Amino acid sequence: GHFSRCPKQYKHYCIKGRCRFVVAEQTPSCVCDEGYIGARCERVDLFY
Amino acid sequence: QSVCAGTENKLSSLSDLEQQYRALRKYYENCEVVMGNLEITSIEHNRDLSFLRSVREVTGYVLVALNQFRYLPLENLRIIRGTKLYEDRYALAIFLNYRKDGNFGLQELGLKNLTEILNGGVYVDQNKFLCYADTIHWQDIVRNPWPLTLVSSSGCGRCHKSCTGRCWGPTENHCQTLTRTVCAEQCDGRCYGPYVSDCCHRECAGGCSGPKDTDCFACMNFNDSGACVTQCPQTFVYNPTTFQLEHNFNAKYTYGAFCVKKCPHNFVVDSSSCVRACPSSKMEVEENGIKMCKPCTDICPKACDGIGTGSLMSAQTVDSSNIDKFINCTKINGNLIFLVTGIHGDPYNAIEAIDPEKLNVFRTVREITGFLNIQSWPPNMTDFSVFSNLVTIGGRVLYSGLSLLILKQQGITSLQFQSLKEISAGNIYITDNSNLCYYHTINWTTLFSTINQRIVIRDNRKAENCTAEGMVCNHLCSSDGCWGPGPDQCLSCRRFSRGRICIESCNLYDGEFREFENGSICVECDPQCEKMEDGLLTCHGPGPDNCTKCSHFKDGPNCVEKCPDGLIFKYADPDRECHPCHPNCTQGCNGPTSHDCI
Amino acid sequence: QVCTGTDMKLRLPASPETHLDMLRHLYQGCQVVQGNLELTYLPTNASLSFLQDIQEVQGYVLIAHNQVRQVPLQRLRIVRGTQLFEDNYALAVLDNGGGLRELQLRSLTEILKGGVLIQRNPQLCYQDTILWKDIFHKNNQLALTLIDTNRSRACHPCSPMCKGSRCWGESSEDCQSLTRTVCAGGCARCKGPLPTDCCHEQCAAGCTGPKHSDCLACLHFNHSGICELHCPALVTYNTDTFESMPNPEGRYTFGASCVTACPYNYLSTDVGSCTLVCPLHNQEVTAEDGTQRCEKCSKPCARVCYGLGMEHLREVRAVTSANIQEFAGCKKIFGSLAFLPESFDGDPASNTAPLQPEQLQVFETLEEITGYLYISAWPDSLPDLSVFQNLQVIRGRILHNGAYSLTLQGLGISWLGLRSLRELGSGLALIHHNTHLCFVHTVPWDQLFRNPHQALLHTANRPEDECVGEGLACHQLCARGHCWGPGPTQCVNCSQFLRGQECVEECRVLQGLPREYVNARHCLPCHPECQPQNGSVTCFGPEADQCVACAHYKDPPFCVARCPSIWKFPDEEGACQPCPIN
Ligand SMILES: *[C@@H]1O[C@H](CO)[C@@H](O[C@@H]2O[C@H](CO)[C@@H](O[C@@H]3O[C@H](CO[C@H]4O[C@H](CO)[C@@H](O)[C@H](O)[C@@H]4O)[C@@H](O)[C@H](O[C@H]4O[C@H](CO)[C@@H](O)[C@H](O)[C@@H]4O)[C@@H]3O)[C@H](O)[C@H]2NC(C)=O)[C@H](O)[C@H]1NC(C)=O
Ligand SMILES: *[C@@H]1O[C@H](CO)[C@@H](O[C@@H]2O[C@H](CO)[C@@H](O[C@@H]3O[C@H](CO)[C@@H](O)[C@H](O[C@H]4O[C@H](CO)[C@@H](O)[C@H](O)[C@@H]4O)[C@@H]3O)[C@H](O)[C@H]2NC(C)=O)[C@H](O)[C@H]1NC(C)=O
Ligand SMILES: *[C@@H]1O[C@H](CO)[C@@H](O[C@@H]2O[C@H](CO)[C@@H](O[C@@H]3O[C@H](CO[C@H]4O[C@H](CO)[C@@H](O)[C@H](O)[C@@H]4O)[C@@H](O)[C@H](O)[C@@H]3O)[C@H](O)[C@H]2NC(C)=O)[C@H](O)[C@H]1NC(C)=O
Ligand SMILES: *[C@@H]1O[C@H](CO)[C@@H](O[C@@H]2O[C@H](CO)[C@@H](O[C@@H]3O[C@H](CO)[C@@H](O)[C@H](O)[C@@H]3O)[C@H](O)[C@H]2NC(C)=O)[C@H](O)[C@H]1NC(C)=O
Ligand SMILES: *[C@@H]1O[C@H](CO)[C@@H](O[C@@H]2O[C@H](CO)[C@@H](O[C@@H]3O[C@H](CO)[C@@H](O)[C@H](O)[C@@H]3O)[C@H](O)[C@H]2NC(C)=O)[C@H](O)[C@H]1NC(C)=O
Ligand SMILES: *[C@@H]1O[C@H](CO)[C@@H](O[C@@H]2O[C@H](CO)[C@@H](O[C@@H]3O[C@H](CO)[C@@H](O)[C@H](O)[C@@H]3O)[C@H](O)[C@H]2NC(C)=O)[C@H](O)[C@H]1NC(C)=O
Ligand SMILES: *[C@@H]1O[C@H](CO)[C@@H](O[C@@H]2O[C@H](CO)[C@@H](O[C@@H]3O[C@H](CO)[C@@H](O)[C@H](O)[C@@H]3O)[C@H](O)[C@H]2NC(C)=O)[C@H](O)[C@H]1NC(C)=O
Ligand SMILES: *[C@@H]1O[C@H](CO)[C@@H](O[C@@H]2O[C@H](CO)[C@@H](O[C@@H]3O[C@H](CO)[C@@H](O)[C@H](O)[C@@H]3O)[C@H](O)[C@H]2NC(C)=O)[C@H](O)[C@H]1NC(C)=O
Ligand SMILES: *[C@@H]1O[C@H](CO)[C@@H](O[C@@H]2O[C@H](CO)[C@@H](O)[C@H](O)[C@H]2NC(C)=O)[C@H](O)[C@H]1NC(C)=O
Ligand SMILES: *[C@@H]1O[C@H](CO)[C@@H](O[C@@H]2O[C@H](CO)[C@@H](O)[C@H](O)[C@H]2NC(C)=O)[C@H](O)[C@H]1NC(C)=O
Ligand SMILES: *[C@@H]1O[C@H](CO)[C@@H](O)[C@H](O)[C@H]1NC(C)=O
Ligand SMILES: *[C@@H]1O[C@H](CO)[C@@H](O)[C@H](O)[C@H]1NC(C)=O
Ligand SMILES: *[C@@H]1O[C@H](CO)[C@@H](O)[C@H](O)[C@H]1NC(C)=O
């Protein structure tokens, strides 16, 4: 795909989610655990 | 006008792809105007996106990334205002929409009515299966050129032989119509043809149907009832013939993107505009139930920065570093939020956790102009001992539709707010509080400002379970507002109360202190007078003139323990009353006559 | 530069001898005329070259009863016509007859509003020639256009090279250039017959190019050389965050144009404009030296003392015994003052008495007039204007006959007085026929004026050498010879000291009379208890603390008349000590 493992400086980038690093745009992102939203998964989902 | 809010997630998404699609529908389905960003990401070729066809406008940026579907049904999107940009550079960004190890991805963009971007750049870059990414006159779309606009399928053909490199699709209905680069030399705006006679108005955006400020497919500045205008009708009009300022008869409030005849009740009316707070040079006042503001000629109270306002624009939460700014505050200008990162610190940043004792800086706050979002709290803070004197919240800024949001608070058993009487506007959402007992004892239509406000309660501690074998309401508290254990946690009591404390009876005829009473409130009387026995009232009101018996002399209408002699002298007898002294009594007095002077 | 007009229609000049000097000072070097432009009763061979600079007139243009052959207005491009002659006309040429020969309005290209009219000019050729409908404005079309071809001179064809025979005069350069009726497009003005010759929506009078920066005249407001709909507001409203904040680009609106700040005599308002009147529920506040602004009242505003031309006094002729009491104890008057024949005489028709010298005392507290002071009658028992001796500032916001802030006509004055006056904010000063005043020549007029286009005009006042020929002249102690009148009390500025109102040579420190302490220009007695010794601190100062020497009963911090009864008594040195008996 377009992403791989997060570099060491991102060990704590994401909270309550799975950290991934996008290679094509050289940019970190996270896949949030159920019920969490936000760029770092730092908030709960009001529609859940 | 079908206004909806954006998701604001950037590249991040949910682990469940089906919920991610259902959420995309829940946010944008049948919407026309998007507040903040329009984010369309990670949707598979097996899911329909036709519910996005009604979107006309976006205030933030439009982001499309990492999808697998062939076509974007964004045909009615006319204008992107660019009030927030992707990576602080781009207003439109469409990239990586394909599978690396397959034949799926975005092929056509749609956008037949997309005419302009007011701010920010354009990002396209890599899109393996996307036709017509190039051959677009982006200078007719961008209002502020930057001599950004990065483009990288090929051999897809042309829209039509008649469309001279002005194409984003395979047919004559995909041809770019130029409105800025094909105009008369005299035009300040955009045109509906290549002549000085078919150019349109200066405030109009996104193309035009005629030369009038009414005839326009979008507006810059304000909407005045269908006219695009630089400014709403003002309370005065300047007369350049006489150098005089004359009063207007058709003036309106400048309010958000609009001109209106009736300002929102919760907002400050300044003289011709409606605002979330008055500027620091003026003092907020109220007259005849109207919230307004006047020049700061007196010693003026100041409100403190909330989360997302003032010096805290970059803050998501109260945290161990910005909590120190709330120490002497009685009013917060902006929102009050506690996220996981604020409370338990953020190891990605230099921010630490908050010590529960540091929360005491908020014990002096009575008003919060924004919303209360509480998603984390320290493990042993079982009630809101901080904010117990909070009087009112919200009215001007809401979180989606909410003014009070409480999610998943496991350490909480009671709320215990004593002074919180009213919510200015917005709904309430309280769920997953598995140990919270007193949440069902509140009559919420007593706290709401209007009959249109609602509350949702689910998944908290079972009310019947707690009532039977847990905690119950105080015998002296009414059915409306029993927030916790004891007579001091009740908002409305039967019989009597003294400030925050509810009581069965008052000290009118007994106790080392005596009171007078009204229908439910009792207050102490002047102690210099005598205490009555045998069930008899000691005082009719707050003073020596009300006391029903006096152990000392009087002075006119009231009981006095010590007479103000030596003023001029004015002696007193011990049994009845104070009396003026003989005119010669300048150095002591024993009475009213000539031999009484010392 | 910027200049104003008289708005007097066809009335006779108040002082014909100064009529050309008035016009030369008001107009020489200005580009824009605010209000009406009136050029009337000019003598044969008048030197009018100072008018060649006028480009734009806000009111009407009136040329009447002149004996001049030509008037140099060839640069005049636009008339706004916001005021109309007889409520009808933006241009009027009347009775100029040996008289006006040619109009010579080469560059005239716009009438926005109101008619043209021409009548009874026997020497004026080519009335008939101009195509007025090209000069008119499309959206108004108010071309009343009454004309009078009954001239006594024979007209020559206007030019061998003017295809339409439409001209401003007898020269080949007088041919009218058309700017509306000759072009293919629907534009109100254009630079040529082609569809690409349209210049802009906001431009007027034609153009040098297709942009709002190219306009030869401009609708709405000129901002800084570009033509614009409104001047940018001082405060901008944020539509996304719902808050109001100062505008980094914010500007003041000023008549025809948009500016960073307003002129000295204009009152700033927070809405983004400058006015001559303060909006309702606002105070005039001198927040910084040299300026003034309006500020909102937090509670109901205090009584405003109005003068003539304002509120209930708008239709009042002059101050009379029926209205003099309205000014009793006022320090600032909102409006003007006028003292005319039938102010100090009677008016039996309305049962109104004449003003008396005692009634004039209502102005003793007056410091500022927000208008003009016009006096054409005064009592013979008053040799001066001492009833206004405390007047400090005349603003000139309202001018007599549109030009004068201070006017004195034929009074029985022997000297001006008014020693408190220090500023004439705006407007001209006219002093004439005043048969016994003379100190007008010693007044420091150059210290009172505040703007260019501002001057004294005078005639028929008693001649200086005939009057100072009696030794009636300014006092030697003061002000390099500048005085308001006779003696050391009529001085402008004392070279040594001022005692009360009198300039004095000596500060009376060590003389036989009650001894005085020194001040930067003043002199004042010791406190009565301070002993009049010959030493310069002993007796002397503004406070008890300087009076170290005591005449009797010295209390250690200060000399007192008696030792206070704790009881005190005088000791062997005359100082107060505590008594053995209290
Ligand atoms: C709001 O922000 C302020 C800063 O602006 C913070 O700082 C001060 O905090 C103190 C304590 O809360 C405030 O109250 C007073 O503190 C005194 C402490 O002693 C010092 O100051 C005195 C001043 O005279 C000096 O003499 C002394 O040497 C010390 O340097 C107390 O003395 C005061 O009360 C006691 O003394 C008086 C004496 O007359 C008695 O009458 C009282 O009964 C009592 O015994 C008083 O408590 C102080 O005013 C703040 N200073 C300023 C400049 O504002 C605050 O802490 C912060 N508030 C909160 C709620 O966090
Ligand atoms: C997206 O693009 C389309 C064009 O590609 C653009 O056009 C709109 O089309 C609809 C119908 O398809 C127009 O709807 C109008 O409906 C009213 C009644 O509800 C009719 O009376 C109108 O008839 C006439 O007048 C219109 C003048 O606005 C003409 O457009 C029309 O041809 C008729 O002569 C008409 O059917 C709609 O008005 C137009 N848009 C406009 C304002 O011209 C559509 O607006 C684009 N969507 C966006 C982004 O707004
Ligand atoms: C002692 O207790 C009294 C009650 O037992 C207190 O009440 C009374 O207070 C009023 C006002 O100070 C005193 O004066 C007169 O009251 C009458 C009644 O009008 C009342 O209602 C109108 C309408 O709302 C209101 O405006 C008034 O303020 C009153 O509340 C007036 O008509 C008179 O003009 C005048 O104000 C009463 O005399 C007084 N009652 C007693 C003591 O007789 C009283 O204030 C308490 N005293 C103290 C120490 O506060
Ligand atoms: C300026 O503001 C006015 C309102 O003051 C706008 O007019 C209104 O625009 C809304 C847009 O949603 C129209 O609502 C639509 O109504 C139809 C009804 O059939 C519905 O099917 C749509 O879903 C939608 O809700 C509304 O009718 C319209 N009102 C009128 C009288 O035209 C106007 O569009 C604004 N102009 C600009 C340029 O923003
Ligand atoms: C919960 O609070 C609501 C108010 O938010 C209470 O409803 C209100 O009840 C009062 C008292 O009955 C109503 O006022 C008057 O009631 C009489 C009948 O008792 C009627 O004749 C009058 O015309 C008048 O309606 C009031 O209208 C009503 N408010 C609403 C919005 O319906 C409610 O009683 C509270 N519940 C408890 C258990 O305390
Ligand atoms: C017994 O009842 C009387 C009223 O009949 C109580 O006095 C009243 O107290 C209220 C506040 O609870 C006062 O209301 C507000 O007062 C401020 C004063 O600045 C004013 O700005 C507000 O507009 C509003 O009026 C009310 O004025 C006051 N009434 C009088 C006549 O003074 C009294 O406190 C009660 N006693 C007990 C023991 O509860
Ligand atoms: C907007 O108003 C400005 C003035 O505020 C107009 O610009 C002015 O144009 C005049 C000529 O029409 C300039 O005067 C001339 O300057 C040269 C300098 O060498 C001199 O040789 C001439 O004798 C004459 O004095 C004047 O300097 C100029 N002012 C500025 C500030 O540049 C402008 O034309 C107006 N725009 C519109 C659209 O009406
Ligand atoms: C007339 O009015 C002026 C102000 O308009 C008076 O003020 C100033 O006074 C001083 C003293 O006479 C003049 O001279 C300077 O004095 C200082 C004293 O310490 C000395 O250090 C300097 O070397 C110089 O001699 C000053 O020039 C003058 N300023 C102005 C603006 O003229 C003046 O006293 C009045 N004169 C008369 C003749 O009444
Ligand atoms: C120009 O002079 C002519 C006469 O030479 C005036 O026209 C006459 O006006 C009178 C007005 O009472 C009529 O009775 C005549 O019938 C007119 N004569 C003709 C031949 O039509 C004219 O009024 C003068 N123009 C102006 C503007 O005063
Ligand atoms: C200080 O002033 C005093 C007057 O206040 C002078 O004293 C007087 O001197 C004359 C000399 O002929 C005597 O006749 C008076 O009787 C004195 N008056 C008093 C009150 O004693 C004294 O000379 C002055 N000193 C100086 C140095 O001039
Ligand atoms: C209460 O939580 C705080 C959080 O900082 C912690 O330091 C403390 O140990 C906790 N107390 C108990 C009794 O667990
Ligand atoms: C109340 O809640 C507790 C939770 O452990 C449960 O065990 C108990 O059976 C409940 N009691 C009643 C009366 O439902
Ligand atoms: C005007 O100047 C001419 C020049 O020839 C002269 O004849 C005439 O007398 C002058 N008029 C006046 C009033 O001086």
Residue recorded with tokens 């970059």: B314
Dist. CA B330–CA C372, nearest whole Å: 54
CB C25 within 8 A of CB C3: no
B466 membership: H or E segment, kind and range: helix B463-469
Q: Do B15 and A22 touch (CB under 8 A)?
A: no
Kindly list the residues from chain B whose CB atom is less than 8 angstroms away from the CB atom of residue C83.
241
| Atom 26 of ligand 4: nearest residue by CA position | B1
- Substitution target from B11, B398, B407 for chain A, most A beta carbons within 10 A: B11
Task: Identify any residues that bridge with C503 across adjacent strands, giving them in sequence order.
Answer: C498
C385 C-beta closer than 6 A to ligand 8? no
Query: Both tokens of residue B295?
Result: 């020049």
What residue ranges define each of the domains in chain A, with the CATH number in brackets? 3-44 (2.10.25.10)
Do C2-135 and C235-296 agree at the fold level?
Answer: no
B450 C-beta closer than 6 A to ligand 5? no
Q: Report CA torsion sign: C230, C234, C240, C243.
A: negative
Dist. CA C433–CA C461, nearest whole Å: 5
DSSP C335-377: SBEEE-TTTSS-BGGGTBPPP-TTGGGGGTT--EESS-EEES-
C-alpha B62 to ligand 3 mean position (Å): 67
Minimum Cα–Cα distance from B373: chain A residue = A43
CB B407 within 8 A of CB B377: no
Map B23-64 to HEC letters: HHHHHHCCCCEEECCEEEECCCCCCCCHHHCCCCEECCCEEE
C409 membership: H or E segment, kind and range: strand C404-409
Quick one: which of C516, B432, C439, C500 has its CA closest to A35? B432
Dist. CA B205–CA B217, nearest whole Å: 6
Query: Both tokens of residue C165?
Result: 């025979």
CB C438 within 8 A of CB C410: no
Q: Do A43 and B10 touch (CB under 8 A)?
A: no
B501 membership: H or E segment, kind and range: strand B501-503
> CA dihedral defined by C13, C16, C22, C24, rounded to 10 degrees?
120
Query: Both tokens of residue B27?
Result: 């946010």
CB C199 within 8 A of CB C190: yes
> Do chain C and chain A touch with ≥3 beta carbon pairs under 8 Å?
no
Which residues have CB under 8 Å from C266's CB, separation 6+?
B243, C254, C274, C275, C276
Task: Identify any residues that bridge with C523 across adjacent strands, giving them in sequence order.
Answer: C518
B3 touches chain C (CB under 8 A): no
C-alpha C250 to ligand 13 mean position (Å): 55
The one-character DSSP state at B420 is -
**Pairing between β-strand B367-368 and β-strand B392-393 as defined by DSSP bridges:** parallel
C570 membership: H or E segment, kind and range: strand C568-570
Kindly list the residues from chain A whose CB atom is less than 8 angstroms away from the CB atom of residue B12.
14, 17, 29-32, 38-41
Dist. CA B295–CA B278, nearest whole Å: 10
**Pairing between β-strand A27-32 and β-strand C428-432 as defined by DSSP bridges:** unpaired
| Atom 5 of ligand 9: nearest residue by CA position | C150
B223 touches chain C (CB under 8 A): no
Sequence letter at residue C116: V
A12 touches chain B (CB under 8 A): yes
CA end-to-end span of chain B: 90
CB B422 within 8 A of CB B449: yes
Atom of ligand 12 nearest to the CA of B470: 1
CB B38 within 8 A of CB B17: no
Kindly list the residues from chain B whose CB atom is less than 8 angstroms away from the CB atom of residue A23.
none
* CATH number corresponding to C311-473: 3.80.20.20
Q: Report CA torsion sign: B315, B318, B321, B322.
A: positive
B216 membership: H or E segment, kind and range: strand B216-219
Q: Do A42 and B11 touch (CB under 8 A)?
A: no
B540 C-beta closer than 6 A to ligand 3? yes
SS3 B595: helix
Dist. CA C482–CA C492, nearest whole Å: 6
- Substitution target from B59, B244, B245 for chain C, most C beta carbons within 10 A: B245
Q: What is the CATH T-level fold of the domain C506-582, as seen in this structure?
A: 2.10.220
CB C212 within 8 A of CB C203: yes
Half-sphere exposure of B80 (CA within 13 A, CB side): 27
Residue recorded with tokens 């309005």: C105
C498 C-beta closer than 6 A to ligand 8? no
Residue B434 CA: which ligand is closest? 12
Dist. CA C309–CA C414, nearest whole Å: 30
Task: Identify any residues that bridge with C430 across adjacent strands, giving them in sequence order.
Answer: C407, C457
What residue ranges define each of the domains in chain B, with the CATH number in brackets? 1-178 (3.80.20.20), 236-295 (2.10.220.10), 304-463 (3.80.20.20)
Atom of ligand 3 nearest to the CA of B541: 2
**Pairing between β-strand B204-208 and β-strand B121-125 as defined by DSSP bridges:** unpaired
Domain assignments of chain C as residue spans, ordered by start: 2-135, 235-296, 311-473, 506-582
CA end-to-end span of chain A: 29
C-alpha B380 to ligand 11 mean position (Å): 6
Q: Which of A2, A27, A31 is opposite residue B13, by nearest beta carbon?
A: A31
B445 C-beta closer than 6 A to ligand 5? yes
**Which alpha helices (H) appear in B97-239, and where do they start and end?**
none
Dist. CA B153–CA C321, nearest whole Å: 97
Dist. CA B4–CA B52, nearest whole Å: 12
Q: How many helices (H) and strands (E) does chain A have?
A: 0, 5
Q: What is the CATH T-level fold of the domain C2-135, as seen in this structure?
A: 24 nucleotide stem-loop, u2 snrnp hairpin iv. U2 a'; Chain A (3.80.20)
Residue B78 CA: which ligand is closest? 2
Which residues have CB under 8 Å from B489's CB, separation 6+?
B414, B416, B418, B438, B474, B477, B482, B483
Quick one: which of B349, B328, B353, B325 has its CA closest to B338? B353
Q: Do B186 and C277 touch (CB under 8 A)?
A: no
CB B224 within 8 A of CB B233: yes
B328 C-beta closer than 6 A to ligand 1? yes
Task: Identify any residues that bridge with B539 across adjacent strands, giving them in sequence order.
Answer: B547
Dist. CA B506–CA C327, nearest whole Å: 64
What are phi and psi for residue C153, nearest 5 degrees? -85, 155
Dist. CA C49–CA C72, nearest whole Å: 6
Kindly list the residues from chain C whose CB atom is less than 8 angstroms away from the CB atom of residue B247.
279-280
Kindly list the residues from chain B whose CB atom is less than 8 angstroms away from the CB atom of residue C58.
241
Structure-determination approach: cryo-EM
Say whether domain C235-296 belongs to CATH 3.30.2320.80. Answer: no
What are phi and psi for residue B79, nearest 5 degrees? -140, 135
Q: C-alpha angle C261/C305/C387, rounded to 5°?
A: 105
Question: Which residues of B lie closer than 8 Å to A, measured between beta carbons?
Answer: 7-16, 23, 26, 66, 95-96, 100, 126, 316, 339-341, 346-348, 375, 400, 402, 405, 407-408, 429
SS3 C312: helix
Which residues have CB under 8 Å from C525's CB, separation 6+?
C514, C515, C516, C517
C-alpha B58 to ligand 4 mean position (Å): 16
Dist. CA C309–CA C398, nearest whole Å: 9
What are phi and psi for residue C50, nearest 5 degrees? -65, -15
Query: Both tokens of residue B359?
Result: 């929360």
Cα dist from B217 to B72, B79, B210, B220, C280, whole Å? 22, 9, 10, 11, 40
